[PDB]
Amino acid sequence: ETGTLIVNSVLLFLAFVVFLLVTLAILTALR
Amino acid sequence: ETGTLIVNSVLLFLAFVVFLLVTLAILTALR
Amino acid sequence: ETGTLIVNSVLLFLAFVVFLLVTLAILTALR
Amino acid sequence: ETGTLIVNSVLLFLAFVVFLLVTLAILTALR
Amino acid sequence: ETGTLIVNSVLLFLAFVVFLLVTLAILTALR
């Protein structure tokens, strides 16, 4: 009906932050 | 009534990203 | 009124996944 | 109107779990 | 219509906590 439905979906984008964390962790561990 | 109810449930899938983080961490620590 | 109210609460369970991450991290660090 | 509005706010408390993770990580790294 | 719509957006701020975790992790790893 409105963006109110997409608002929750937008939050779902937080899943990217997780890979960001591993990005730094792997940047030092490599293997 | 509508998917609006499942939308929140979908976000719950974010729980998988957590194991993904430990996956990389354990891939270097093993033990 | 309906489970729609509990749906958000259910997501709150995600707080457990956090301790799960530290569980593996501490399983290698111990101290 | 009702707690339904606070329910989402309650979930926001999950922000504490994040510091909990760093707490253990820093407990071994110190520096 | 009301803040009820912004409430979900506010939770989105949790994305900051993720960088906070890497902040401590990188504070010890540097590289």
From Swiss-Prot, chains A, B, C, D, E:
The chain crosses the membrane at residues 7-27. It comes from the Viruses. It is found in: Host Golgi apparatus membrane. Homopentamer. Interacts via C-terminus PDM domain with PDZ domain-containing host proteins such as PALS1/MPP5, TJP1/ZO1, LNX2, PARD3, and AFDN/MLLT4. This may lead to disruption of tight junctions between epithelial cells. Interacts with membrane protein M in the budding compartment of the host cell, which is located between endoplasmic reticulum and the Golgi complex. Interacts with Nucleoprotein. Belongs to the betacoronaviruses E protein family. Plays a central role in virus morphogenesis and assembly. Acts as a viroporin and self-assembles in host membranes forming pentameric protein-lipid pores that allow ion transport. Also plays a role in the induction of apoptosis. Regulates the localization of S protein at cis-Golgi, the place of virus budding. May act by slowing down the cell secretory pathway. May interfere with tight-junction stability by interacting with host MPP5. This would result in disruption of epithelial barriers, thereby amplifying inflammatory processes. This is Envelope small membrane protein. It comes from Severe acute respiratory syndrome coronavirus 2 (2019-nCoV). The chain holds residues 8 to 38 of 75 of the full protein.
